[PDB]
Amino acid sequence: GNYNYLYRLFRKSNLKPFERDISTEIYQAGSTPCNGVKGFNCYFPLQSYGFQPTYGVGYQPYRVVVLSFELLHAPATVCGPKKSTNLVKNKCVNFNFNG
Amino acid sequence: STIEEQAKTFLDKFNHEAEDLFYQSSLASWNYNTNITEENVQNMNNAGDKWSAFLKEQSTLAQMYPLQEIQNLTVKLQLQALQQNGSSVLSEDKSKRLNTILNTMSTIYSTGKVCNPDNPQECLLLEPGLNEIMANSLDYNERLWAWESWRSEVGKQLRPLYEEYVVLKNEMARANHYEDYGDYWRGDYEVNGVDGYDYSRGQLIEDVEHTFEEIKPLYEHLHAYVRAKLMNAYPSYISPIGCLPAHLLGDMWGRFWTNLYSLTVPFGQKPNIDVTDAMVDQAWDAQRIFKEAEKFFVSVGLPNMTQGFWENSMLTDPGNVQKAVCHPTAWDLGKGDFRILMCTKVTMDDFLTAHHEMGHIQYDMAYAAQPFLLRNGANEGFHEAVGEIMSLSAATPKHLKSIGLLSPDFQEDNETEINFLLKQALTIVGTLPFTYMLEKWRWMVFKGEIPKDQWMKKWWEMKREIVGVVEPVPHDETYCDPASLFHVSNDYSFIRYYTRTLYQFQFQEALCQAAKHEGPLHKCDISNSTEAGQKLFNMLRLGKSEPWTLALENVVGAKNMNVRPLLNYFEPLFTWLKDQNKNSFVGWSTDWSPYA
Numbered sequence A: 001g002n003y004n005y006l007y008r009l010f011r012k013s014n015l016k017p018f019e020r021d022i023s024t025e026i027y028q029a030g031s032t033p034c035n036g037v038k039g040f041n042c043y044f045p046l047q048s049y050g051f052q053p054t055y056g057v058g059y060q061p062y063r064v065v066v067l068s069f070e071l072l073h074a075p076a077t078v079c080g081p082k083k084s085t086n087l088v089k090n091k092c093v094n095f096n097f098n099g
Numbered sequence B: 001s002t003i004e005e006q007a008k009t010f011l012d013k014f015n016h017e018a019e020d021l022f023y024q025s026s027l028a029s030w031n032y033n034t035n036i037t038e039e040n041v042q043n044m045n046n047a048g049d050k051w052s053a054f055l056k057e058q059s060t061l062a063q064m065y066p067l068q069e070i071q072n073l074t075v076k077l078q079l080q081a082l083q084q085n086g087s088s089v090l091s092e093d094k095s096k097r098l099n100t101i102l103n104t105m106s107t108i109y110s111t112g113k114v115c116n117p118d119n120p121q122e123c124l125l126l127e128p129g130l131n132e133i134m135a136n137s138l139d140y141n142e143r144l145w146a147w148e149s150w151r152s153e154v155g156k157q158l159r160p161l162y163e164e165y166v167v168l169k170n171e172m173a174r175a176n177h178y179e180d181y182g183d184y185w186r187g188d189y190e191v192n193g194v195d196g197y198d199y200s201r202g203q204l205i206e207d208v209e210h211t212f213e214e215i216k217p218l219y220e221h222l223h224a225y226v227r228a229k230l231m232n233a234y235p236s237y238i239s240p241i242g243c244l245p246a247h248l249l250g251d252m253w254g255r256f257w258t259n260l261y262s263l264t265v266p267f268g269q270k271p272n273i274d275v276t277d278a279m280v281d282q283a284w285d286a287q288r289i290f291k292e293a294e295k296f297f298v299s300v301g302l303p304n305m306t307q308g309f310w311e312n313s314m315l316t317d318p319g320n321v322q323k324a325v326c327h328p329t330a331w332d333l334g335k336g337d338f339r340i341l342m343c344t345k346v347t348m349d350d351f352l353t354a355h356h357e358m359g360h361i362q363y364d365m366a367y368a369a370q371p372f373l374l375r376n377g378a379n380e381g382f383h384e385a386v387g388e389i390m391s392l393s394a395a396t397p398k399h400l401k402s403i404g405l406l407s408p409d410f411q412e413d414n415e416t417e418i419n420f421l422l423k424q425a426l427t428i429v430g431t432l433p434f435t436y437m438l439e440k441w442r443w444m445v446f447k448g449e450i451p452k453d454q455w456m457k458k459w460w461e462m463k464r465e466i467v468g469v470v471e472p473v474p475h476d477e478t479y480c481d482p483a484s485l486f487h488v489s490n491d492y493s494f495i496r497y498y499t500r501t502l503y504q505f506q507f508q509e510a511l512c513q514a515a516k517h518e519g520p521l522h523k524c525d526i527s528n529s530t531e532a533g534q535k536l537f538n539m540l541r542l543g544k545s546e547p548w549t550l551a552l553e554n555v556v557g558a559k560n561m562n563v564r565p566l567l568n569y570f571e572p573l574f575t576w577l578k579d580q581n582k583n584s585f586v587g588w589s590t591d592w593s594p595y596a
Ligand SMILES: *[C@@H]1O[C@H](CO)[C@@H](O)[C@H](O)[C@H]1NC(C)=O
Pocket: B035, B037, B322
């Protein structure tokens, strides 16, 4: 059982987009103050996924990479590769050299 | 803030933590079952103790949320399931005594060895030493000796233990706001809070009697026919007017009559539908058996088995060096892990068992979307009934012809259908009066209707009245004849077989009506019908989230258990038995006319 992977199961409000919450403060589900102790109505927010090889396909670990592309007023520098068509000389051709 | 949100967070942490502890306990049990080694036993015991302690702590913490301030039906159902004390309401000394009594009954039943006086050098255990003698012998005094000696040893050991057991279980049940332990068992079918679909604990006994009153003519005719055939087999022991002798029913206790098919066959000259030789000729492996079962389930529209099912199941006996339990069991380990533990041979019985256990796996897969504490059947009957319907459908000659296991030029005449229906009646109909009489006797024992000094005098009186089975010699109160069976000695409910039997044919009629089958009910196959699979899967996906009455409305369109599909299934056989019983006398007399 791999218990190095954790998830938040409880929070007072929903997350905003692209927000990270790494707080380990005890979740207060009741009127009573938690006081740092996981007693009645006060749970620990982060729970672990016990990833084991014999799990089902809907419970197996999946690595997710989300790529976020934004265009801002600054000069755009992450560009895609541009191919180089084999140079032809001594003929009337349409040339595109560095724009 | 509110109580309902607190309960929802509690049942959101509970489901995940319990799912993890469950998976670990179930995996330890699996590793014990496929590999009987002492470290696996220790790991199983540690996981079980952790699981039980965790269930005790969550039961202690769940009761602090009052039920009447929660309106959501699913949350109230999970909280009702969790808030049961179980044995925790009883004192620690009495709880320890009850656990000790249950464990020692388990050891007495499992390691009980009985053999003939004056020849004690070797003895035979119940499985398979006594089972084979009861199922295959034709000798009157040998079966009488085995039956009386095993009930003498087991009953004389278990009678004070059972007398303590009834008092402790009644004390726990009255401590849990129940009338008796019988009411505690009947509370599984209790539905409360749903308008129109409410079911009471007291309604179950009335419904069982109402169904059994319609069972009784068919069972009387079957009993008369079996009585005539056993009179042919044993000339002088069986009376024309009396009950059947107890040790002649083909099994140790009378649970099934399926071992009397050889003696009571209508048409021996006609062939059987045995397909074992065809699989031997075509070299069918157990993997091919499970692939054909998977093909059957994809034909009706249900999902196919996962890759982890094929990778992680043990479908063949491992070998001499590694020991495993031979009993076929479907395991829903949790987290989408589904396995079958079966030592599959090339037989028809193993093929039907593979269909039955894959039906169990399909039922387990269907409610995987549900929360952890609602991942069960709506009652104890549905879970077995959905496997028994697969056992019914797979056993049909149309299914065998469709998969190529039966010759396409096999003549399906009335005589083979009559003898097949008689075999299915001996297996299915014959267990119903025994099940009903045993459960009614246990309910009267728990309720206090029968005093301890009059347990057996009533019991045989019930058996003559209901089952039509007479004792060979009278038994006094030093015997404990019921507790020789596995379920009663190890604290298991027995009405699940009765409910399973009725739900089986109700589901069979519903799916055959959905599949538009136009012939006899026993000639019906539910393969290739997407709509029948959809009608099944609508109930299958619910699990324990909805009442069993609403699930039965979803399948058959009725709000209550019904007996008419069973009688419709055996109607050709019922007419044949009525024709064959013209000379003989249907019904029995409770007097001592055969033997006492
Ligand atoms: C069964 O247990 C034995 C005990 O040593 C072990 O060697 C073997 O690998 C186990 N087999 C399986 C299939 O788990």
